[PDB]
Nucleic acid binder design. Structure first.
Lengths: 93, 32, 100, 223, 68
RNA sequence: GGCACCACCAGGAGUGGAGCCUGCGGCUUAAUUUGACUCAACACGGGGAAACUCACCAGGUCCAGACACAAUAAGGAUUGACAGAUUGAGAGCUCUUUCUUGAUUUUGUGGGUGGUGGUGCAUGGCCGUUCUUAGUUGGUGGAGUGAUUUGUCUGCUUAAUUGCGAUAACGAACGAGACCUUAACCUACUAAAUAGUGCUGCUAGCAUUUGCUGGUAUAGUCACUUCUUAGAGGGACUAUCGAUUUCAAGUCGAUGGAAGUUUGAGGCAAUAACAGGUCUGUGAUGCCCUUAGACGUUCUGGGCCGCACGCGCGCUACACUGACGGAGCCAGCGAGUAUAAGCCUUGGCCGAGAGGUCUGGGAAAUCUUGUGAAACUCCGUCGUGCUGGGGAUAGAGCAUUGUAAUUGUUGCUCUUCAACGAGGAAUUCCUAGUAAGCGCAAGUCAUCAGCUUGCGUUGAUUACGUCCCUGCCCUUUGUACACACCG
């Protein structure tokens, strides 16, 4: 699917820094909450990553549950241009 | 398990799996 | 001194009665005049469905139920004394609401 | 959002039911048993019961951190509103839940059903469970579907105690040929109960006689 | 019908075979006495158990009873 | 032999005869989707379908084809699109139009993804049936070379493999029963301004007797729980007595008792199983088909309603124990909202009505609601007439629901005044607050209940017996059957 370059980013550093993604299975929803972009944009953008082994996916209750892998952090280390040495929320302990 | 065989070893091999777990499940808790 | 009301609601009564009891005890050794607990008429939550997922066989029905019971307690006490009782008598089954 | 008392405790069940379902899918590999939601002031305690509380909350508790974060983002909850702890179950055999998925992992590895079915039955009998029955039905290398029930020990079947002493767990283990559904029925010993009744309704326990003493005719004992 | 079952028949008659003297031809005292001797989970079952117990004693008084 | 109002006796109420709602087949059809056909198909798929549901029919879009490659691509892979044409469409869907963003992305393959597509005779799970009948199994002992058998049975009794009794068996386990939920008792406890009462104030009416009936008192800063609610318990265990019987299990008549039919009604409910039903509930699935001109999806218009016909569950009725028109005026189960996308909706004000307007209360024993319901009670009109019993067919107008009511959603007003004058052969349900009448609520619901699920009002006739019909169970018996007579 076609996603603009600017909108796809807000999806990405939502998969960082509280990188667990819960999306309702409703592609016609105008906006997935806390992510100022289309709801159908959120699910598919993470579908490629969970297609190529960078995030886990879970289906239940027509509700999706995504989490950022440790292997997926390296993918986001450079593509997000984020500074080195930062652990988002789940490794803080 | 319709044969005359695979049930003698369907019990004794099965029960030693449990006998392998009673020993293990009693090791993790006592030595905690 | 303040006219304060406390409501106890739950689905199970042994949990509901326990929370009701020791709060009353907290107003026994403490000389706070008490009204309650008032046993509200129980409300049975029923829904009548069909046993058959398809539409074949005998005409037989499933009648599930929930029993929810209410206890309202009236208090004449300061806001500090009433608040600490609930956290002493907190237990997961019953939700605790306090209204002045 | 104001909700009526009828629709409030109903929502609590649906939330508990849906939350309980999510843990089963998410933490099946660790032998997850069940969830306890102890409501408490200024916190939503959620207790996860699993055989392996090391895989869950693993590598310095990474998984539990990314689990409780998966919860707050769907239930509109503040980050401080929940605190989740992991505890190991006391009796794995006595719990019909854990052994059901424990059977599921053993079933998937191609082991013969006779070896697999009895491999947990003697474990439940190892744990002291009064009875256990495992049922496997479906297809295995044959077109026709057949059932095999493997009962052991004592069984109760009808009435109110069937809810107090019997816990069940039904799972469908994925086979390449079709669906294989299983049922595991396990009873804690009535003497092992601490919450409800400690015995069967018809259990009549007679005390022994106190007689066979010697009585002397008519003395008086002054202390 | 009002036919007693075996679980109330054999449980009752063991009581006579162990505590014959302290029983009495009256239900209520027997009802209270069986409440302290045997652990009975249900009061309906105890009232069933105690009822056959007194009736057996009424039979023991009027002759020799079989099986006790 | 035994049990059974899913069998009969004796009865009651019916159905089957008319119209109508609904379903089945049949017929038609563009589709009139389809599952199911003895009990165990046919107001069943909660299946009361304008749109959606929908799987069907005639049309039109979207990729919502992830990911690894090969092709192309900055000198732009390509997406969104103003005017017009076209189309049902103000679908840039497309065609002329040359604009516009820019490596998300366009082609082919692998790989997939999704299906109310087929396969319930490839399956799970659930439900129904066997059968809610009462049946099933092992331990030690006996019989048998063994598979097996006894236990687990001539007789009585019970709702009952439930007990007595007889006994090569003795003692047990599952099922039944026990158990749980609900109904009946509690002046005996625990309390209740979200229940009531009595007092006490404050007040109003009629007789004046100081009496009788209301209202008010979230400060009268009253008492109480009898009745209303629920929590802790007690209470029944065939109790006592006459009989009958093996004097045993039990049963029948009385007495007391709240209750002496398993105290009443249900929930749960065994060993294996059925080619019983469902892939038309699941992101539950194996296989076959498709998968971009999609059998995915979306949106438009139509359909499940369509009518020469056979059948079933029912409602009105066939009149007088009745129709109306007045007057009396009593139940119980339940439901409810906030920035929604609209709940129950009072009280007032308009409207004959349906309906319309303005306020408030209730997120709930508070308010909707005492849901002041109808049968029923009393008083009159009708007077056996297809009558004023009945409301089919049909027209006109008035409203509400919803984007959208035409194939009339539904109601109301007027009008239209159909068969039906008690139902052949058959056959259904039922033993006490039961049958039969009589209404109200929750459900599917934006609207629609002649349907179910519940509740309550009035409330019976006759049995309380049997194996005559039927069905099932058990034993004996027969077998050339064991895929088990659909052999």
């Amino acid at each position: 699917m076609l996603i603009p370059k600017e909108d796809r980013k807000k999806i990405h550093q939502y998969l960082f820094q509280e990188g667990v993604v819960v999306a309702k299975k409703d592609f016609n929803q105008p906006k997935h909450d806390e992510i100022d972009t289309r709801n159908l944009f959120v699910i598919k953008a993470l579908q490629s990553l969970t297609s190529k082994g960078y995030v886990k996916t879970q289906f239940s209750w027509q509700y999706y549950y995504y989490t950022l892998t440790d292997e997926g952090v390296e993918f986001l280390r450079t593509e997000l241009n984020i500074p080195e040495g930062i652990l988002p929320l789940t490794r803080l302990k | 398990g319709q044969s005359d065989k695979r049930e003698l070893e369907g019990e004794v091999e099965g029960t030693e799996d449990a006998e392998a777990e009673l020993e293990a499940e009693a090791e993790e808790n006592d030595e905690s | 001194i303040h006219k304060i009301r406390i409501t106890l609601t739950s689905t199970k009564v042994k949990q509901l009665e326990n929370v009701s009891a020791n709060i009353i005890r907290n107003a026994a050794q403490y000389n706070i005049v008490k009204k309650g607990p008032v046993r509200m008429p129980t409300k049975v939550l029923k829904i009548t469905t069909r046993k058959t997922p398809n539409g074949e066989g005998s005409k037989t029905w499933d009648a599930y139920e929930m029993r929810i019971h209410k206890r309202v307690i009236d208090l004449q006490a300061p806001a500090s004394t009433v608040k600490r009782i609930t956290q002493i008598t907190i237990e997961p089954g019953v939700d605790v609401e306090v209204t002045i | 959002a104001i909700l009526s008392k009828k629709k409030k405790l109903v929502a609590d069940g649906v939330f508990y039911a849906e939350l309980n379902e999510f843990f089963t899918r998410e933490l099946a590999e660790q032998g997850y048993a069940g969830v306890e939601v102890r409501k408490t002031p200024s916190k939503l305690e959620v207790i996860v019961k699993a055989s392996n509380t090391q895989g869950v909350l693993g590598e310095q508790g990474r998984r539990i951190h990314e689990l409780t974060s998966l919860i707050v983002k769907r239930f509109k909850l503040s980050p401080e509103g929940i605190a989740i702890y992991a505890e190991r179950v006391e009796e794995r055999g006595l719990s019909a839940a854990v052994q059901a998925e424990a059977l599921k992992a053993k079933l998937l590895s191609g082991l013969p059903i006779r070896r697999a079915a009895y491999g947990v039955l003697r474990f439940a009998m190892g744990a002291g469970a009064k009875g256990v029955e495992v049922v496997i039905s479906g297809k295995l290398r044959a077109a026709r579907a057949k059932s095999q029930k493997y009962a052991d020990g004592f069984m109760i079947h009808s009435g109110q105690p069937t809810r107090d002493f019997i816990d069940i767990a039904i799972r469908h283990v994925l086979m390449r040929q079709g669906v294989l559904g299983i049922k595991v029925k396990i009873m804690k010993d009535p003497a092992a109960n601490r919450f409800g009744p400690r015995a069967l309704p018809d259990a009549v326990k007679i005390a022994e006689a106190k007689d066979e003493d010697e009585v002397i005719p008519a003395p008086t004992v002054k202390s | 019908g009002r036919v007693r079952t075996k679980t109330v028949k054999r449980a009752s008659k063991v009581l006579i075979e162990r505590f014959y003297p302290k029983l009495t031809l009256d239900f209520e005292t027997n009802k209270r006495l069986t409440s302290e001797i045997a652990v009975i989970q249900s009061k309906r079952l105890r009232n069933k158990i105690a009822g056959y117990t007194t009736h057996l004693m009424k039979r023991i008084q009027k002759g020799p009873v079989r099986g006790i």
